[PDB]
Design a protein around this ligand. Structure first.
Ligand code: HEA
Ligand code: HEA
Ligand SMILES: CCCCCCCCCCO[C@@H]1O[C@H](CO)[C@@H](O[C@H]2O[C@H](CO)[C@@H](O)[C@H](O)[C@H]2O)[C@H](O)[C@H]1O
Ligand SMILES: CCCCCCCCCCO[C@@H]1O[C@H](CO)[C@@H](O[C@H]2O[C@H](CO)[C@@H](O)[C@H](O)[C@H]2O)[C@H](O)[C@H]1O
Ligand SMILES: CCCCCCCCCCO[C@@H]1O[C@H](CO)[C@@H](O[C@H]2O[C@H](CO)[C@@H](O)[C@H](O)[C@H]2O)[C@H](O)[C@H]1O
Ligand SMILES: CCCCCCCCCCO[C@@H]1O[C@H](CO)[C@@H](O[C@H]2O[C@H](CO)[C@@H](O)[C@H](O)[C@H]2O)[C@H](O)[C@H]1O
Ligand SMILES: CCCCCCCCCCO[C@@H]1O[C@H](CO)[C@@H](O[C@H]2O[C@H](CO)[C@@H](O)[C@H](O)[C@H]2O)[C@H](O)[C@H]1O
Ligand SMILES: CCCCCCCCCCO[C@@H]1O[C@H](CO)[C@@H](O[C@H]2O[C@H](CO)[C@@H](O)[C@H](O)[C@H]2O)[C@H](O)[C@H]1O
Ligand SMILES: OC[C@H]1O[C@H](O[C@H]2[C@H](O)[C@@H](O)[C@@H](O)O[C@@H]2CO)[C@H](O)[C@@H](O)[C@@H]1O
Ligand SMILES: CCCCCCCCCCCCC
Ligand SMILES: CCCCCCCCCCCCC
Ligand SMILES: CCCCCCCCCCCCC
Ligand SMILES: CCCCCCCCCCCCC
Ligand SMILES: CCCCCCCCCCCCC
Ligand SMILES: CCCCCCCCCCCCC
Ligand SMILES: CCCCCCCCCCCCC
Ligand SMILES: CCCCCCCCCCCCC
Ligand SMILES: CCCCCCCCCCCCC
Ligand SMILES: CCCCCCCCCCCCC
Ligand SMILES: CCCC[C@@H](O)[C@@H](O)CO
Ligand SMILES: CCCC[C@@H](O)[C@@H](O)CO
Ligand SMILES: [Ca+2]
Ligand SMILES: [Cu+2]
Ligand SMILES: [Cu+2]
Ligand SMILES: [Cu+2]
Ligand SMILES: [Mg+2]
Ligand SMILES: [O-]
Lengths: 256, 535
């Protein structure tokens, strides 16, 4: 399996997209980025021009005007129009994001200090996920020869330290996955950047998210609500595989 | 003598606020230097559990030298205490005390021709509540806290149930600290509002009040509505921790998300309380050094009033991933976007003030020009984050950290520096050396941009907030960001040198108005410094 959902050295962009929702986010952000870079460059060029054109050695008697009504009507309406354009493209994206479709696969995620518990209610499967290198695996949340060995044996490298977990949430490609997120002790937050999803794990509440992964691979996330001393050390691994590789994984969990 | 600390004159309280805010700012900036030392490289090298077994002072100095990973057991609790302490100090005990308690107490009465605040003894009490709060905040760092260590590692907004489960009583000291800070702010707001309405000089109609005084006035109203709410929110934390209540605990029918609504109902107004007096200072500074009256004085006033009001109906943009329904998410995103229109009016009117003027590029003007550019960078990423669909990715990442450092530490802080260089001659009778103010500006301009612009990249790559350590791939831009913070720190030590030089041996100020005629408010008609008893 290819490692796809991961930060890359020196990266300045988004993590690669592996869901339609993530693709929408990349487009909406790129659309807004061109606009706000245009606004910022515009404002900056105005300031640099005004400082150059009206420097005291070049303009020695200052004007005195304090109004210009065509300009003020312009610079009030054009922002309003820019923002309405942004809202028009971004509200559909928000609506696609938050309207939960019908699940092909259903996973119930519980956040703990400091690890994640997964249950597949249709399959009567449940397990816990700890960072490779956490105390659960024998470590103390730092790199070491033993931790590097465990990463290799699990199919990763030392580069995936702090992202890779001992167990992964396995899902089939091109299926609608609905995840139900809650917290067991404090608030945590479950996210996978490559899927464009993030949902807080609040004790006493069950909240839902959805994704449909569009290619196979490995995708990482990290807990995203400060939860205590090992907030930095309770990540998320998602493996997207073929329909029958997924069934194979299911069957390996079935007790006869 | 301690005749400074018992003074009730608004000028002396303003100076006490300025200096205290500056000292606390130095402490909190020092925390960030340590933070960025640990973030400079992946793996944990400084915040080792091994350093706890030594004493407080010995373990301190061991903490500042790097260890190899194999000899360093990561101590995430110390990281969480440092960043919590850094944020609490900034948001409650540094920038509002400097802008509002400092420049507000000193110059708002001068700007309206008032001899003093309406309740001078209330003003002196407000300063001591600020120092009491500051002392509890610092004491909490050394009190028994989470995980059987010292200090509270719960973030500056104290989300439950983490904040109500954290062991020890360090968190209780932090809550008391925030109580005292709100009390100090409420007394100040009462004084500003009474003085503004009741003690203007004869002839000083409200449409003749200078913009700075307006900004303090609007800020004082936001305080009166926002801070009592915060006092409620955090008292409920105190009663869940200590008096058996269950407001935020699901076992007893509570809801942790209820706390977030109450807290952010204060939490967003808090940032407009921070920045409005900086808006006021930018207007005075830009008018002076463009040698041109402010463009659109009345839209400037109304835009500040519009921003202040809208700031109270947008709070849940801090909660897009906390379980808001689609309808709430769509409202708060649209209400938040509106704030860009009044703010843009002020940005464009500051450029319009420069336009057609005769521009003098002295140090206060450099800070104000930097403000215009850098506040715009921070404000447009705030608009990005307002899109809940995109905040899904950016929430709790360093893209948020980049946003709010551009509006706060390259925005509001630039307004603080613009004010200090603008007014130090008027307050002290001594003038700063021009070349050093310019060098301070350019060192801070380069360093602060190197510090925080790469955090946009880290956020886009998915780096979460409040992490002691990070995956290897985030190393490059974390390294650049730490170099920028070290340069920024150098620029601030140099600034403290510049202030020390100015006050002990700076060129003597002889003029009442040592700038020019377009510094046209009443403080420039008085001596430098103004007489002990005004108007
Ligand atoms: C000085 C303090 C300050 C100020 C002024 C602001 C101003 C704004 N902020 Fe910010 N913010 C913070 C301090 C501040 N903020 C802090 C501390 C946090 C994190 C809290 C925490 O979690 O710890 C935060 C986080 C925060 C969030 C939550 C993000 C998250 O946690 O995921 C959001 C949501 O939208 C937000 C948006 C905005 C917007 C829309 C503005 C607007 O007011 C900005 C408007 C300004 C401009 C837009 C630029 C000028 C305008 C023009 C040039 C006109 C043309 C522009 C357009 C048409 C776009 N900020
Ligand atoms: C005013 C607000 C303010 C200011 C000025 C700063 C200044 C800095 N901050 Fe930040 N910061 C916060 C508000 C601020 N901060 C908040 C609210 C949080 C959230 C905490 C949490 O997560 O709970 C935070 C968290 C935060 C993080 C994320 C931590 C994490 O998620 O783990 C980082 C990362 O490096 C950071 C670094 C810095 C650096 C390097 C500086 C500076 O070193 C940059 C350079 C600035 C200077 C050199 C001087 C600044 C001037 C003054 C402060 C004026 C006082 C002086 C006078 C009156 C003379 N701080
Ligand atoms: C104006 C005043 C501002 C004060 C700023 C103080 C700056 C101090 C810089 C710290 O020095 C570096 O710290 C790194 C640790 O982050 C070390 O990383 C190296 O050494 C570590 C071992 O401790 C390894 O784990 C790292 O991978 C490796 O990059 C490195 O040797 C060391 O030179
Ligand atoms: C975006 C921000 C860019 C800022 C643009 C500045 C506006 O331009 C100026 O506005 C004035 C309008 O107020 C005009 O003065 C015009 O109107 C004045 C009356 O107020 C007259 O005194 C002048 O002679 C007359 O040129 C002037 O020509 C024009 O260049
Ligand atoms: C990082 C911090 C940021 C720095 C903020 C800027 C510092 C503010 C100015 C310093 O304080 C001033 O110092 C003057 C010293 O010359 C005093 O003059 C005083 O001098 C005599 C005593 O020295 C008094 O009798 C007079 O009333 C009075 O004119 C003046 O009162 C006082 O306000
Ligand atoms: C811990 C942080 C460390 C930060 C390091 C700061 C380094 C400071 C550089 C010192 O050199 C200074 O350069 C000034 C500017 O060139 C000189 O001003 C000289 O040049 C100016 C012209 O620019 C004149 O206004 C002055 O009168 C004249 O003294 C000044 O003499 C000289 O001492
Ligand atoms: C922790 C870091 C601490 C770093 C603190 C450094 C900040 C203090 C800068 C002091 O610089 C002074 O600036 C003056 C310029 O304003 C110079 O006067 C020079 O310039 C005047 C001309 O403007 C002459 O009249 C003077 O005689 C001549 O000495 C003076 O030499 C120089 O020392
Ligand atoms: C009281 C409570 C504690 C207060 C904390 C503030 C402590 C800061 C002390 C800084 O004092 C300055 O130190 C510089 C030397 O280290 C001197 O600049 C000198 O060195 C600069 C750099 O070379 C030159 O530009 C200048 O010309 C030259 O005056 C400067 O005169 C002097 O005033
Ligand atoms: O993604 C497209 C989106 O379109 C519709 O959503 C509308 C909604 O119906 C209207 O009330 C409007 O005000 O908001 C949305 C604008 O996109 C569909 O209802 C929705 O299911 C679909 O995802
Ligand atoms: C990969 C980027 C190298 C560091 C850039 C410094 C500016
Ligand atoms: C594919 C690389 C994207 C790099 C974009 C950098 C985003 C920087 C955000 C800052 C916006 C301020 C105008
Ligand atoms: C202005 C937006 C530029 C386009 C964004 C790139 C899209 C990234 C994902 C596309 C991959 C589709 C499978
Ligand atoms: C309790 C098991 C959770 C999954 C652990 C790792 C996933 C195994 C890989 C599944 C098929 C990959 C091709
Ligand atoms: C001189 C006191 C200001 C704080 C300096 C920042 C360094 C903090 C080191 C923390 C050491 C852990 C006990
Ligand atoms: C090669 C052994 C380590 C050399 C680097 C030590 C850097 C220590 C910097 C300490 C900074 C104190 C604020
Ligand atoms: C005695 C328990 C603490 C009570 C604090 C105030 C509770 C009222 C909640 C009001 C909700 C927000 C204003
Ligand atoms: C964003 C602030 C930029 C302001 C332009 C400064 C140009 C200064 C040129 C030198 C002036 C004499 C020192
Ligand atoms: C009279 C000379 C102008 C004073 C300029 C002082 C600052 C020069 C630029 C410094 C840039 C530092 C990065
Ligand atoms: C590979 C070790 C990197 C060590 C870099 C330390 C740089 C310290 C920068 C201090 C600069 C202060 C302005
Ligand atoms: C200025 C108000 C912005 C609102 C806008 O983004 C959307 O509501 C339009 O569909
Ligand atoms: C592919 C194997 C499916 C086996 C199925 O019966 C179990 O998941 C039910 O416990
Ligand atoms: Ca490190
Ligand atoms: Cu967690
Ligand atoms: Cu966490
Ligand atoms: Cu807000
Ligand atoms: Mg969060
Ligand atoms: O905010």
């Amino acid at each position: 399996l290819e490692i796809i959902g991961r930060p890359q050295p020196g990266g300045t962009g988004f993590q690669p997209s592996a869901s339609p929702v993530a693709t929408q986010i990349h487009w909406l952000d790129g659309f807004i980025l061109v606009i706000i870079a245009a606004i910022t460059i515009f404002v900056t060029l105005l300031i640099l021009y005004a400082v150059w054109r009206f420097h005291e050695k070049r303009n020695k008697v200052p004007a005195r005007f304090t109004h210009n009504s065509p300009l003020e009507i312009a610079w009030t309406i054009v922002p309003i129009v820019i923002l309405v354009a942004i809202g028009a493209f971004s509200l559909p994206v928000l609506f696609n994001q938050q309207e939960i479709p019908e699940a092909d696969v259903t996973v119930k995620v519980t956040g703990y200090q400091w690890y994640w518990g997964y249950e597949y209610p249709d399959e009567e499967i449940s397990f816990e996920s700890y960072m490779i290198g956490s105390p659960a695996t024998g470590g103390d949340n730092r790199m070491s020869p033993e931790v590097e060995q465990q990463l290799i044996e699990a199919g990763y490298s030392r580069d995936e330290f702090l992202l890779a977990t001992d167990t992964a949430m396995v899902v089939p490609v091109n299926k609608t996955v609905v995840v139900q997120v809650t917290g067991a002790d404090v608030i945590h937050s479950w996210t996978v950047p490559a899927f464009g999803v993030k949902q807080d794990a609040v004790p006493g509440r069950l909240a839902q998210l959805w994704f449909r992964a569009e290619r196979e691979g490995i995708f990482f996330g990290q807990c995203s609500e400060l939860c205590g001393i090992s907030h930095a050390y309770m990540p998320i691994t998602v493996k997207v595989v073929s329909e029958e590789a997924y069934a194979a994984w299911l069957e390996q969990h079935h007790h006869h | 003598f301690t005749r400074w600390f018992m003074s009730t004159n608004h000028k002396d309280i303003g100076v006490l606020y300025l200096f205290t805010g500056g000292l606390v700012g130095l402490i909190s900036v020092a925390f960030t230097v340590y933070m960025r030392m640990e973030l400079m490289a992946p793996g944990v090298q400084f915040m080792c559990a091994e350093h706890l077994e030594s004493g407080l002072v010995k373990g301190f100095f061991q903490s500042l030298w790097p260890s190899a990973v194999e000899n360093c057991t990561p101590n995430g609790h110390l990281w969480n205490v440092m960043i919590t302490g850094h944020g609490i100090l900034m948001m409650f005990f540094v920038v509002i005390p400097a802008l509002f308690g400092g420049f507000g107490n000193y110059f708002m009465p001068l700007h309206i021709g008032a001899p003093d605040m309406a309740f001078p003894r209330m003003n002196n009490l407000s300063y001591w509540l600020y120092v009491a709060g500051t002392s509890l905040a610092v004491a909490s760092l050394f009190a028994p806290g989470g995980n059987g260590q010292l200090g509270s590692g719960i973030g500056w907004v104290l989300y439950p149930p983490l904040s109500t489960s954290e062991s020890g009583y360090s968190t209780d000291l932090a809550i008391f600290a925030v109580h005292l800070s709100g009390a100090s702010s409420i007394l100040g707001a009462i004084n500003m509002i009474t003085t503004f309405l009741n003690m203007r000089a004869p002839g000083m109609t409200m449409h003749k009040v200078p913009l700075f005084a307006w900004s303090i006035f609007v800020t004082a109203w936001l305080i009166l509505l926002a801070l009592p709410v915060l006092a409620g929110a955090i008292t409920m934390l105190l009663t869940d921790r200590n008096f058996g209540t269950t407001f935020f605990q699901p076992s007893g029918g509570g809801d942790p998300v209820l706390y977030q609504h109450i807290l952010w109902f204060f939490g967003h107004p808090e940032v407009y309380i921070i920045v409005l007096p900086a808006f006021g200072i930018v207007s005075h500074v830009i008018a002076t050094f463009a040698k041109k009256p402010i463009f659109g004085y009345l839209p400037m006033v109304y835009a500040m009033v519009a921003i202040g009001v809208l700031g109270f109906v947008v709070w849940a943009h801090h909660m897009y991933t906390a379980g808001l329904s689609l309808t709430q998410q769509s409202y708060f995103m649209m209400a938040t976007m509106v704030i860009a229109v009044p703010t843009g009016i002020k940005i464009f009117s500051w450029i319009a003030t420069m336009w057609g003027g005769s521009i003098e590029l002295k140090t206060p003007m450099l800070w104000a020009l930097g403000f215009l550019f850098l506040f715009t960078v921070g404000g447009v990423t705030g608009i990005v984050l307002s899109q809940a669909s995109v905040d899904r990715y950016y929430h709790d990442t360093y893209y948020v950290v980049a946003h709010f450092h551009y509006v706060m530490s390259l925005g509001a802080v630039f307004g603080i520096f613009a004010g200090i260089y603008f007014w130090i001659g008027k307050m002290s009778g001594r003038q700063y050396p021009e070349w050093a103010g310019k060098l301070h500006f350019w060192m801070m301009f380069v360093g602060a941009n190197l510090t925080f612009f790469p955090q946009h990249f880290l956020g886009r790559q998915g780096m979460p907030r409040r992490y002691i350590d990070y995956p290897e791939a985030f190393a490059t831009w974390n390294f650049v960001s730490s170099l920028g913070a070290f340069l920024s720190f150098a620029s601030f030590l140099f600034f403290l040198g510049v202030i020390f030089y100015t006050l002990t041996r700076g060129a003597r100020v002889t003029a009442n108005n040592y700038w020019n005629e377009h510094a046209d408010t009443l403080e420039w008609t008085l001596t430098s410094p103004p007489p002990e008893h005004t108007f």
